């Protein structure tokens with residue numbers, strides 16, 4: 453049946469539930485369809501198609517349309533980053549401390565929010581978009597420009613021919629899913645980070661647990677804050693991956709940043725915070741970024757789900773000392 457390529461692909465996909473799936477191999481084996489194949493795999497794996505009556509050809513058609521609205525000419529914020537965050541969100545949902553906590557609708561909404569979360573990303577920043585006085589910035593009034601755009605595009609794509617994967621959800625299911633997907637994606641904006649991180653801490657502070665090992669989340673605010681933190685954790689999971697992956701990701705985001713620095717030079721604009729080709733030390737930037745943003749976030753999350761995130765925290769801590777070695 454399968455081509456031998458499909459077979460090689462299938463064996464790699466046997467790792468979808470493991471942290472550090474080789475997402476870059478999967479992109480190669482798949483003809484640059486990492487997003488399509490990982491989503492499909494997860495959806496079958498989690499039985500999402502039957503539970504929500506999603507016709508499989510519609511699912512495929514939409515996945516492929518979604519992936520083609522990621523830019524192949526963008527080093528980091530592309531389909532592979534999309535697939536990576538989706539699969540990471542998928543692993544985090546399986547964490548033992550959230551066993552049987554979230555409904556299928558909420559799972560569906562977290563995975564879907566991951567898949568569309570950066571779609572149509574240009575490879576430059578909100579501030580850049582605001583400074584260039586770009587259309588996108590005028591539309592969204594300089595407020596969460598890219599993140600508002602990813603949502604509008606992710607949803608509009610469901611209207612293309614044979615693309616409505618939510619065609620069989622009730623109005624009720626659709627309105628709740630939508631709101632969940634909008635809260636999750638707007639929370640990927642980095643300027644929400646501290647606020648998001650603070651609530652997580654407060655969650656951990658006042659943390660309750662009941663009847664067997666399972667977190668007690670009994671109102672919307674609490675349930676959505678967790679999902680929001682989960683996906684935002686997945687968005688910032690590169691330095692917790694095995695170093696081979698992490699280094700490939702660091703390569704890509706640095707390429708994107710310098711290329712924006714270039715576009716800022718090519719327009720007299722002033723330079724971005726360490727987007728400086730020629731003048732910015734990657735090794736240092738990684739270390740501070742871990743100590744100030746990535747470690748605190750993941751340290752809290754580890755707290756929340758203690759101790760299922762131990763190896764994760766540990767890898768991050770190693771990758772951090774490894775970047776220090778590089779002075």
Ligand SMILES: C=COC(=O)N1CCc2c(sc(NC(=O)Cc3cccs3)c2C(=O)OC2CCCC2)C1
Nearest residue numbers: 642687688690691701702705709725726737738741
């Ligand atoms: C103090 C707040 O600053 C702040 O949030 N930003 C500046 C730095 C930075 C992001 S996102 C990101 N990277 C990721 O979202 C995913 C990763 C890809 C490879 C490692 S991590 C980096 C970064 O990693 O590097 C920067 C730090 C200073 C120079 C660039 C946004």
Ligand SMILES: [Zn+2]
Nearest residue numbers: 569570640641
């Ligand atoms: Zn983003």
Ligand SMILES: [Zn+2]
Nearest residue numbers: 533569570687
């Ligand atoms: Zn992202």
